[PDB]
Design a protein around this ligand. Structure first.
Ligand code: A1BKE
Ligand code: CL
Length: 167
């Protein structure tokens, strides 16, 4: 039993809700919140910009030190950093950005990072400003993630379409 509330159950391990991931994280304080990161951990907009804003820029400060030490992530890769006031940990995961021409096949590799964590609060990878089809992202999530994932979808219209079209 966990504290996630109001989710629709899609499969044995995948759950979904129309919610602002920032507000959801502040309420649940999950062990892991997933960020929709880029390879530079520049949290400018989308989910990343919102999460970072909610940390009062502490996420960005920590991220800049991470990059200075380690260099950029790979597309499809991840790193674990602090969750600040939102979660114990933040798993920064880089899905392919279609608006940069990146291989959509890397979306499966990106979701594989979730399997290293027993329970996660997450957005749909490569959705939103990353330019991929969110219906496809949900399909890859369900077919790749085996651990317990709670998906927050900000847009109510999109949430209803994802549920109604789910096979
Ligand atoms: C007062 S706060 O600082 O805690 C704070 C905050 F800075 C930002 C947000 N959410 C936002 O910006 C959503 C539009 C951002 C979004 C979410 C999910 C996917 N794509 C975009 C909520 C907060 F509660
Ligand atoms: Cl977004």
């Amino acid at each position: 039993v966990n504290s996630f509330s109001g989710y629709l159950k899609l499969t044995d391990n995948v759950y979904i809700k129309n919610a602002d991931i920032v507000e959801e994280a502040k309420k649940v304080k999950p062990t892991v919140v997933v960020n929709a990161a880029n390879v530079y951990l520049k949290h400018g907009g989308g989910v990343a910009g919102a999460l970072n804003k909610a940390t009062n820029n502490a996420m960005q400060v920590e991220s800049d030190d991470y990059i200075a030490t380690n260099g950029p992530l790979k597309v499809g890769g991840s790193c674990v950093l602090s969750g600040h006031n939102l979660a114990k940990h933040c798993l920064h995961v880089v899905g392919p950005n279609v608006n940069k021409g990146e291989d959509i096949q890397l979306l499966k590799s990106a979701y594989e990072n979730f399997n290293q964590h027993e329970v996660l609060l997450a957005p749909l990878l490569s959705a939103g400003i990353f330019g991929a089809d969110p219906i496809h992202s949900l399909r890859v999530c369900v077919d790749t993630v085996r651990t317990n994932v709670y998906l927050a979808v900000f847009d109510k219209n999109l949430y209803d379409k994802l549920v109604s079209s789910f096979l």
